[model samples]
Structure formats: structure tokens, C-alpha cells
Target: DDTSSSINFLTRVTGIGPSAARKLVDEGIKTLEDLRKNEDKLNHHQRIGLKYFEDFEKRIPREEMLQMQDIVLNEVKKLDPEYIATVCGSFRRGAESSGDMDVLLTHPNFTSESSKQPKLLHRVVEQLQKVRFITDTLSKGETKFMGVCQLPSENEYPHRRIDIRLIPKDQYYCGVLYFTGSDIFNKNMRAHALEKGFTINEYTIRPLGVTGVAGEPLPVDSEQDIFDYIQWRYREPKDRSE
Candidate 1:
């Protein structure tokens, strides 16, 4: 199964040897659920695989992550009052900590009322730019904003990489899958998508055999819709990052 192949990529980073890595594979510990819930039972190699957890936990704690969620929530409230954002990536998968925060932004206005207007991604970014905490813009464009900023680190000057993006509501689910990544996970997802005759790009994915180019885009009403449409089991953020 691809499960062992997948988990091996993670094992490489944490130095999990062949035997223990295979054990995790056998246990279907392909996602964070396996690691988190069964930490007490991990063998020596598996324990080594989890060695980075301590350092990672130090980088992003639960309280700080929640605060980041609130910051994004408040920003969305100011920019698009009707919008709702859910923290995806590591935070969504029940990670005790996360490397970076990934949030999926969406709103009722996207399809019902504001579809007629110019894109709102830039507008949201503009609002974020004004926040003092945002500090500086590393990159800002129509679909995303990535920046290096600080958040009351040990000293105010100790800045971290704080990236946020504004994505189309329709692509929210796929974007969540893409950005809430561990590098290997995203590559695998794209590969799977392609195998199913769909090609995923930054903007959209087109089915290979579709001929009539009626440009009415698919509507992804929620995260669940993404899984239903893509025909893959929905994985939590923690598992996704793993």
C-alpha cells in the first residue's frame, strides 16, 4: 500500500528506521491520529520519529495558535462581515502545535451577492495590510499573502514567518489541502487528482475528458463537498501535515 511509502517520507525527517516505520505503516498510522492517540505505545524507532514534537510544540503552542485564529477571524470580520474562516492544516488535525497556521476563508457573499463585483481577495489583503501586527508584506497578490512578521515573541523583535492567503471560496477545500501540507502530502494529493483525470492548478482544475467548455464553475459549498466531489476520504489537518 502507498501508506508505507507515504509515512516513510515523514520518517526520513525524524530518523525513523525501517522496522519501526513499517510498524507505523501496519498500524495505519498514516496520519496524526495514530501518533497522537497512541504515543504511549510507540516503539524505539517510532519514538525517534516523534522526537521533533518537543521542538515543534515550542514553536507553536495551543494558546498562540488560538490567538492567531482570532486575529484572522477579526480581520475577516472587518473585511467581509459575512465571511467565515476555519483553521485547517495542523490546527484542524488536533496537533498540540503547528508549524504554521492555515485558514480557509469563505463567505455567503462569494456566490450569492458579490459574484458580480471585482474579486475580493485583494480587498481582504488590503485590510490585513493595515493591521500593525501584520508588519510587512512578503508577497501580496490576487490570491494569497505571505509575510514574515512578529507576534509578541520572546522579544518583540523576534519575528516568525506568518503567512496568510486569500483564496476563492470555491477553491477553498483544495487550497486547504494544498497549503496545509508537509510537502509530500501535497504532491501526493495532486498526483491522485491527476490520476482521476483532473488537473489541479493554482486557479482551477479541469476534468480531462470534458469537451463542452461551458464555463460555469463548480460550487464547493463546504469542505465536505470537496471530499465528496474528489472521492477521497477527508483527512484532518494533523494527519494532512503528517
Candidate 2:
């Protein structure tokens, strides 16, 4: 309604700051949607917020996701044929679009009881970077890689956010199941597991002991195995939605 109110409203939009909001108002970018249309009017300080806003609204086409998935997985396969890699998240859930990509990986050489091989993940990142598939890295560690990637074709595709995680062999299926989540479904699944006298997590599933202890992890060969062990009916990727 007024200057103070406008400044407050703009700042509350997440990306816009006090000074940026003030400047935005003067430039007639008074409403949140105005900033969307007049983003070029923003200075560096103001544009920072718009950058985040745009990214927040981003989504990748399912077709694009598959292509990107193929490239990342194939690259890792070349690095080591033994390296197991796949895309999880909405992509795995058969969603028409994905907000982001989750790249899950595992190897026989990496395990929870054994020493962590950060180099395994590093090699994946390096090869992707060398091929210019990964455009920017937000974080790099022994277990995870957070970054952005772009397709290397004639048509320009926007840079997409990606997370590459290296999981232990024994925990791969559980991790994959957990990563391919619609939060509500996972909650329902865990609760169902508990009811069946078992405990389940992104890592593993174990029988519930009488004295509040968890028994050893049960062997899980597939998604069906997890469901069967929990005494819950198997839900396919397209059917496991919230």
C-alpha cells in the first residue's frame, strides 16, 4: 500500500533484499510478478534475488531428464564397468517433469565397514568436468557431488541442478528406494515396515528386537524384496507415488 509496506513485501519474497526492494519499487517493479517481467531493470544486487526466483521456478522435461541420465550413467560406465549408477528422484518415479535430478551410484569396492573411497566419486566428477558436461560444482565430497549440468548438443538446454551420491553396496537398494521418493509414500512405507516388526531407513532394513534393538539387516535383492520383507505389497515406480 505504501513505501514501507512495499519494501517489506519485496524483501519477504526470499530473493529480494532491503536495498534491492527499495530500488525495485523506484523502478516500478513494485509487485512480485513485476520483478518477473522486469528482471532486466534490476541492478546486480536486485538481480541476485531474481536469479534465485527463476531457479526456484525451474523444471526439466522428462525427455531431457532421460537424455541427461543416459549421458551421466554412460560416462561412469566408461570409468569402470563395475560402477553401478542410476537416476532416482521424480525421474525414477515416472513423473512428467522433475524439479531436480538425483544421481545415485554404488560399487562393490565401496562399503560401510570398509574405508570410504572419495576418489571413486572424484573420478566421476573429473570425467564429467573434462567433457564439459558438468558446468559448475556446488559441492564435492567423498559421498556426494552437488552441481549443474548442460546437454552438449546444438540446441541450448538450460543448466540443470544435479546431485550425485555414492552409496555403499549393501545399502544400494534401500538408498535407491529412499531417493526415489514422494515424501508421503516413504513415510507410509517406513510406518508400514515398523508395523511388520521391522525398521527401515534410507540405509537398510532390520527386524525389530523385543528389547528395542534392531536386528541385522535383511538381504534385499530388489524393490520387491523390500516390500515383501515388510509384508507390504510391491508398488512399482509409476505406482509408488504419494
Candidate 3:
């Protein structure tokens, strides 16, 4: 079963197919730990595969996610109580286990332009690092931080993947709807939006004219507004697991 699961996983990552996977296993390359040492033999993408090997393989348990949610919410609130933050993706879907944690964040004062200063995002990340909550930065910018974090030693949790996205107040719900997605469901929703002469994405929903040119973004007050725009009934996040 380990052999089969290993092969299946290798197939999912870049470069290694059944034959290559078999060869690696035959040559005693097992575990991401083993794969790391053999990086010299891996291609560019596989090298990235090797880099995040352990983190990618690790799953975040629901309890760990709850603790992380509390930690992040409390820490971010220190800067601005009006800032909104919620764990999205599978965690928001109430999955028992998740490949990683994705969080959507927004603050009334932190727009794309205003965010350039106080750089609320960077400050938040800095604070997270101060408490040793964040350990590594894969990438960071004015609007997003993709990194790894762990609970304080008293909690003794695994290094979990985390993403923090800063959205404008106007687009906050759209961001939430997009990140709180099942890919297939999002795709279907998009297709339906298109059929209704509108286009929907993480940023905004725009109307399509008779010539098929997209108009300015329509006002979206809430995730329910997105459904309203396309004439679909609202579905709760828990019901969006599809």
C-alpha cells in the first residue's frame, strides 16, 4: 500500500511518472526526505517539489486550524479592530482535514493604494513573525503573504502552509467567494455567470453588453449579491462543499 500510495503521489507532482517512480523506489528513494537528497537528479519543477516536499505532504487538522484562526484573528485585531479575516478554502468548508490553510483578509482602511504605506499586511506578517507564529516566507507583497506558520511551543503543532490575502473592502466578499471554493463549483458558477451576460471573478462581477464587451464592475455588497447578480439562489458556505 505504501508503494502504491507513493507512486500515486509521485505521479501528482511534476516529472515522476509510473516508470520513474518505480525506478526511484527501486533505487531506495522513498519518502520526501529521501527525494530531497536526490534533487541533483530532479528537474526544475521537481526541485520545487523537493523544496516544499514536507510542507505539501502535511495536512492541517481541524483543531489546529481553529487554534490558528484564533491566533491570527487576535493578532491582526491589534492593528485594526475593523479588519476582517476568515479562514477560507477547505478549512472554511469544515473539512476534517485540509491540505493547507487559506485566509482572506480585509480592512476598511487598507485599500490597494492606501496599503502601500503602513503596509498593514507587512506589519501583520511582522507581528506574526515576532511571536514565531510565522516561520518562512515563500512570497509576500502588498496584498498577500504566502508562508508557513506553527502554533507556539505550548501547542506544538506541525509547520502548516498558510496564505493571507488583503482585499479591498469593496471586493472583500468576492474574494471570500472565490477563495471559499471547490474548483469545479467555481468553474460552474463562472460558466453560469457568463451565460447570464456577466463575468465573475475574485475581484469583481461585471456586466457583458450585447457586443460581449464587459462593463464596469457591478456593486457587490455580499457573497449573496454575487448570486443575486446571476439570478441564482444564495447558498451558505457550508453548502458550497461541491
Best by lDDT: 2
Arrange candidates by lDDT, highest first: which order? 2, 3, 1
Across residues 29-74, which tens digit of lDDT does each residue of candidate 2 receive?
Answer: 7777787788677654355435455563579999999989888988
For each candidate, the alpha-carbon lDDT, in order, equals 0.59, 0.82, 0.79
Error of 3 at 89 (Å): 0.5
Error of 2 at 110 (Å): 0.4
Per-prediction TM-score to the true structure, in the order listed:
0.54, 0.78, 0.76
Q: Model 1: runs farther than 4 Å from truth?
A: 1-58, 86-88, 101-131, 152-157, 194-197, 201-205, 210-217
Q: Candidates 1 and 3: which is better by lDDT?
A: 3
**Which candidate model has the greater TM-score, 1 or 3?**
3
- Residue pairs clashing in model 1 are 93-238
Candidate 3 residue lDDT tens string, 1-242: 97888877776654576787778877777677778778876765466545666666778888888988899989889877887888899778778888777888887776645645437678888989997898777667778887878878863566777889888878888889899998877888999999999888888999988778767887876899999999999978778856
Q: How close is candidate 3 to the true structure, as a TM-score?
A: 0.76
Candidate 2 wrongly placed segments (more than 4 Å): 1-56
